[PDB]
Amino acid sequence: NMPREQLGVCAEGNLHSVYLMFNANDNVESQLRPCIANVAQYIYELTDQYSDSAFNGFVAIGANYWDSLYPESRPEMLKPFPAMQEGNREAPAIEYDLFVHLRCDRYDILHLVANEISQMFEDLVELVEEERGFRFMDSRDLTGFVDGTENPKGRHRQEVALVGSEDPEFKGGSYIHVQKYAHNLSKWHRLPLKKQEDIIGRTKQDNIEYESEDKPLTSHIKRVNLKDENGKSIEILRQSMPYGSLKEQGLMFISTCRTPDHFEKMLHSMVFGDGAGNHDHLMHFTSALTGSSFFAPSLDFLMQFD
Amino acid sequence: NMPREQLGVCAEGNLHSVYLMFNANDNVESQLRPCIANVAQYIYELTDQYSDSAFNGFVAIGANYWDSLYPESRPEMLKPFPAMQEGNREAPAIEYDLFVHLRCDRYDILHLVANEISQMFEDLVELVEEERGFRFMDSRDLTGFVDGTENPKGRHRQEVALVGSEDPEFKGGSYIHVQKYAHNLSKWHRLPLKKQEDIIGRTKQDNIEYESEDKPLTSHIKRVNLKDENGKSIEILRQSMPYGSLKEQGLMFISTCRTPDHFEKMLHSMVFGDGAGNHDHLMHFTSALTGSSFFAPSLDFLMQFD
Ligand code: HEM
Ligand code: HEM
Ligand code: NA
Ligand code: NA
């Protein structure tokens, strides 16, 4: 298995993270492609340098810019963010050329690395968005509920997240989708505890999954636990973290997967619901401000250039 | 000594911090004064609740708003930020009604506390500025030099920072000045090491103070180490931390002192220099974007209301 996946795609959780969205200047693709190689490599190398603080990271590339940078070849299923909307439940698409996802248990080291990576890009791209993620309590979303529990574990993570020999040229790569969710915390926190629990489908403190028969059809976990046309579970590996500040704060939702339709099917099920009009009531409490599709290739793919 | 100083004024350093600047709505002083009491108290109480992560904090009150909130009485020496400027060396004044200074070795807890404090203010004030500070490496400024070394230590901190029986009514309070310094890091980091060291007056890595005779008259430490009309050292207790992000980043300079002219004399010496036109060359590398004067009273002063 010659291609090497970037280490931050499947990494276990961290106390802190940085999210950097760049858009490229006109006609710079000849110069960026090798510069992206250096950055990808550096990010990999930093895993070992900063092992002490579990550093890890990845560089991913926007769906709408792939063909300016990599015109000769393409991931089989790559496409733009799947915009959708019903009522107040809006999932907009806002694409960026490049995404740099950085993680560590030390914040000072991410500040340093970010500064460094920014200098690596020279005057070839513009920084468009920057946000900083943080672990909240014992891996909780700012809603006060534990986020992460039913994620793939150990080697299953690789199985779920990484492209394999279905697409030989891009094996080691992952399909990435990012939604910046701005929570309405004042509205949420006026809910009685039982309502909160009924919206997620788990108890808050102890984080105990409801029994099947007890899960409401409008609950987050009922809506995003799907099975394929053959009964098999349809999974993703999420890497999301709380983010923001008083002005604006919520979840930086990140999906990683060997196929892009897993996230889409889940999102459809959340916005549009089950078919008897049972949608995801969690969506009454937060708003997705962005929606971006990327591909994060293997290191080896990124490096074959200049 | 009945008045109790707020615990965050003299606190030892922390890994993280939040800085919140609020301006009050029209004619709300009757309602704010007791609400400020609750907030001050809460911040104190949180020192014990979150001892595990060395939590501490203070609420301070702008020079230009003191008399709307506390018309009956005033700190003896309280006045606006001492604006000054020569050449490109600008120290502007931008005052805010209230400052909430929060600190902790855990960032998640500060996010929570900030959210909470914001809700305490209701619709009586507007949030105007928020920034987050962080320890960089072994307590270094983003210049790569250790910041803090010659600060007062142990009980001397209290001696330097806190008003005493010179002003009985406000004993336990401190005079606070805040400058948001935006560093030009690209410019700084093109300096050869010896130049950097010559600008600060200490060696970078080992942080060794230059000998007197070797300190250049334009070096930061030469300029801000002053003696009074009787030879005695003129001190302040700084509580500054690195802050910001790629868009903008530098030092959140914070001075705390029992008298406000200490910081002023230092700042004058930095901007205007020694008198043979030897100013502080550090100022060629960073720009002070804000300049705010506050008073942080004792808890007991703040609490005597409604
Ligand atoms: C405001 C944004 C969101 C929040 C606060 C949130 C929160 C949660 C929480 C608390 C859980 C239960 C703990 C766990 O099993 O991980 C969960 C489960 C899950 N979420 Fe979300 N989520 C959000 C958005 C999304 C989105 C947009 C998707 C997909 C497009 C998604 C997919 C999933 C999946 C696949 C599970 C595991 C369910 C299972 O199989 O048991 N989440 N989420
Ligand atoms: C860009 C903003 C600033 C930076 C990066 C900076 C950095 C430093 C550094 C690296 C030191 C030496 C280590 C130490 O003894 O603490 C120092 C010392 C000091 N600084 Fe600054 N400083 C800044 C602004 C200021 C300002 C605005 C003042 C006063 C208005 C000030 C007052 C002092 C004092 C009193 C000392 C101790 C000097 C001594 O007695 O040895 N600093 N500063
Ligand atoms: Na490098
Ligand atoms: Na409270």
Side-chain angles (χ1 to χ4, degrees), chain A residues 2-78 80-121 124-162 164-170 172-226 228 230-231 233 235-246 248-301 303-305, chain B residues 2-78 80-121 124-162 164-170 172-226 228 230-231 233 235-246 248-301 303-305:
Chain A
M2 194 82 175
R4 295 172 285 170
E5 78 266 31
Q6 292 185 65
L7 300 181
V9 178
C10 296
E12 294 298 334
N14 293 78
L15 300 176
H16 301 289
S17 65
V18 182
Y19 310 112
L20 306 177
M21 296 293 183
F22 298 92
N23 278 345
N25 299 334
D26 281 9
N27 310 320
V28 202
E29 304 90 340
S30 181
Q31 313 174 238
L32 193 46
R33 210 185 301 123
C35 161
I36 283 173
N38 293 317
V39 171
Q41 187 183 244
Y42 174 60
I43 288 174
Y44 189 93
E45 291 174 340
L46 288 172
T47 290
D48 293 315
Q49 186 175 348
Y50 297 121
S51 63
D52 203 354
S53 70
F55 175 100
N56 66 81
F58 69 74
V59 194
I61 291 150
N64 279 2
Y65 189 62
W66 184 268
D67 292 333
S68 303
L69 261 187
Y70 301 109
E72 278 170 316
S73 75
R74 271 177 65 87
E76 184 184 31
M77 304 189 71
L78 183 60
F81 183 85
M84 46 180 99
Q85 164 170 67
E86 188 164 74
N88 292 338
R89 302 180 300 281
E90 202 178 306
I94 297 175
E95 311 279 7
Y96 305 98
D97 291 354
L98 296 172
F99 176 37
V100 176
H101 178 97
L102 309 177
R103 259 158 67 162
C104 194
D105 298 341
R106 288 185 57 168
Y107 180 102
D108 55 359
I109 284 170
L110 294 168
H111 190 88
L112 180 147
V113 165
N115 279 341
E116 256 305 328
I117 280 167
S118 164
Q119 294 185 48
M120 290 175 84
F121 282 126
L124 293 169
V125 304
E126 288 292 352
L127 180 67
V128 183
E129 304 285 346
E130 169 170 18
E131 300 290 348
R132 301 208 168 184
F134 61 98
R135 181 173 289 177
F136 186 66
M137 305 308 84
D138 39 337
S139 309
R140 321 183 84 109
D141 174 83
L142 290 158
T143 50
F145 285 75
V146 174
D147 188 32
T149 301
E150 288 291 302
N151 254 359
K153 303 283 191 257
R155 273 284 124 183
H156 199 58
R157 302 167 86 79
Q158 277 69 18
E159 194 87 8
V160 172
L162 300 179
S165 44
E166 334 73 78
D167 195 13
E169 174 164 12
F170 301 93
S174 186
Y175 291 97
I176 301 191
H177 294 95
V178 183
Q179 295 197 276
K180 187 175 83 174
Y181 281 92
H183 292 356
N184 189 353
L185 291 176
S186 55
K187 189 189 178 160
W188 177 256
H189 289 325
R190 308 210 60 174
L191 295 172
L193 175 59
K194 185 58 169 196
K195 306 222 163 197
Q196 297 193 21
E197 297 182 332
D198 276 9
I199 281 155
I200 286 151
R202 305 178 76 96
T203 61
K204 196 161 175 174
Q205 196 57 220
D206 296 335
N207 187 28
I208 299 152
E209 184 169 12
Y210 282 20
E211 293 298 315
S212 287
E213 61 275 27
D214 299 317
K215 279 178 191 197
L217 274 52
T218 53
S219 61
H220 191 40
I221 306 316
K222 184 55 162 185
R223 292 280 86 240
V224 302
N225 185 289
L226 309 163
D228 74 7
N230 286 307
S233 296
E235 275 172 283
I236 54 149
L237 175 78
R238 290 162 286 149
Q239 289 286 5
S240 321
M241 300 194 57
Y243 89 94
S245 83
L246 291 186
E248 169 193 296
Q249 71 189 289
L251 191 72
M252 186 64 62
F253 183 88
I254 307 187
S255 170
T256 71
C257 193
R258 86 203 291 178
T259 173
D261 45 14
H262 285 195
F263 163 85
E264 193 185 316
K265 286 161 153 39
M266 280 160 180
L267 186 70
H268 181 298
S269 163
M270 299 183 36
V271 168
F272 291 99
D274 72 354
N278 295 293
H279 67 259
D280 180 354
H281 283 203
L282 180 52
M283 296 198 67
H284 304 159
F285 299 93
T286 190
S287 313
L289 300 185
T290 68
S292 310
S293 195
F294 307 95
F295 195 80
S298 68
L299 191 59
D300 295 79
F301 181 85
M303 287 186 168
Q304 73 204 317
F305 297 110
Chain B
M2 194 82 175
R4 295 172 285 170
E5 78 266 31
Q6 292 185 65
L7 300 181
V9 178
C10 296
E12 294 298 334
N14 293 78
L15 300 176
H16 301 289
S17 65
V18 182
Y19 310 112
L20 306 177
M21 296 293 183
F22 298 92
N23 278 345
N25 299 334
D26 281 9
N27 310 320
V28 202
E29 304 90 340
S30 181
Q31 313 174 238
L32 193 46
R33 210 185 301 123
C35 161
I36 283 173
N38 293 317
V39 171
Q41 187 183 244
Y42 174 60
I43 288 174
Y44 189 93
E45 291 174 340
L46 288 172
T47 290
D48 293 315
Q49 186 175 348
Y50 297 121
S51 63
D52 203 354
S53 70
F55 175 100
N56 66 81
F58 69 74
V59 194
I61 291 150
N64 279 2
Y65 189 62
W66 184 268
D67 292 333
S68 303
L69 261 187
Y70 301 109
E72 278 170 316
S73 75
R74 271 177 65 87
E76 184 184 31
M77 304 189 71
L78 183 60
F81 183 85
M84 46 180 99
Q85 164 170 67
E86 188 164 74
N88 292 338
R89 302 180 300 281
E90 202 178 306
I94 297 175
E95 311 279 7
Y96 305 98
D97 291 354
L98 296 172
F99 176 37
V100 176
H101 178 97
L102 309 177
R103 259 158 67 162
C104 194
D105 298 341
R106 288 185 57 168
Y107 180 102
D108 55 359
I109 284 170
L110 294 168
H111 190 88
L112 180 147
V113 165
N115 279 341
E116 256 305 328
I117 280 167
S118 164
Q119 294 185 48
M120 290 175 84
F121 282 126
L124 293 169
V125 304
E126 288 292 352
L127 180 67
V128 183
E129 304 285 346
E130 169 170 18
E131 300 290 348
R132 301 208 168 184
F134 61 98
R135 181 173 289 177
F136 186 66
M137 305 308 84
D138 39 337
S139 309
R140 321 183 84 109
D141 174 83
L142 290 158
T143 50
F145 285 75
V146 174
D147 188 32
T149 301
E150 288 291 302
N151 254 359
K153 303 283 191 257
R155 273 284 124 183
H156 199 58
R157 302 167 86 79
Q158 277 69 18
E159 194 87 8
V160 172
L162 300 179
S165 44
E166 334 73 78
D167 195 13
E169 174 164 12
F170 301 93
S174 186
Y175 291 97
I176 301 191
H177 294 95
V178 183
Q179 295 197 276
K180 187 175 83 174
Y181 281 92
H183 292 356
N184 189 353
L185 291 176
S186 55
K187 189 189 178 160
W188 177 256
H189 289 325
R190 308 210 60 174
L191 295 172
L193 175 59
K194 185 58 169 196
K195 306 222 163 197
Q196 297 193 21
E197 297 182 332
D198 276 9
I199 281 155
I200 286 151
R202 305 178 76 96
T203 61
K204 196 161 175 174
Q205 196 57 220
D206 296 335
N207 187 28
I208 299 152
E209 184 169 12
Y210 282 20
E211 293 298 315
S212 287
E213 61 275 27
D214 299 317
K215 279 178 191 197
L217 274 52
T218 53
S219 61
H220 191 40
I221 306 316
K222 184 55 162 185
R223 292 280 86 240
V224 302
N225 185 289
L226 309 163
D228 74 7
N230 286 307
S233 296
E235 275 172 283
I236 54 149
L237 175 78
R238 290 162 286 149
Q239 289 286 5
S240 321
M241 300 194 57
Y243 89 94
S245 83
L246 291 186
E248 169 193 296
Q249 71 189 289
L251 191 72
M252 186 64 62
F253 183 88
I254 307 187
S255 170
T256 71
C257 193
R258 86 203 291 178
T259 173
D261 45 14
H262 285 195
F263 163 85
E264 193 185 316
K265 286 161 153 39
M266 280 160 180
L267 186 70
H268 181 298
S269 163
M270 299 183 36
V271 168
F272 291 99
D274 72 354
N278 295 293
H279 67 259
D280 180 354
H281 283 203
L282 180 52
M283 296 198 67
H284 304 159
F285 299 93
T286 190
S287 313
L289 300 185
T290 68
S292 310
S293 195
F294 307 95
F295 195 80
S298 68
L299 191 59
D300 295 79
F301 181 85
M303 287 186 168
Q304 73 204 317
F305 297 110

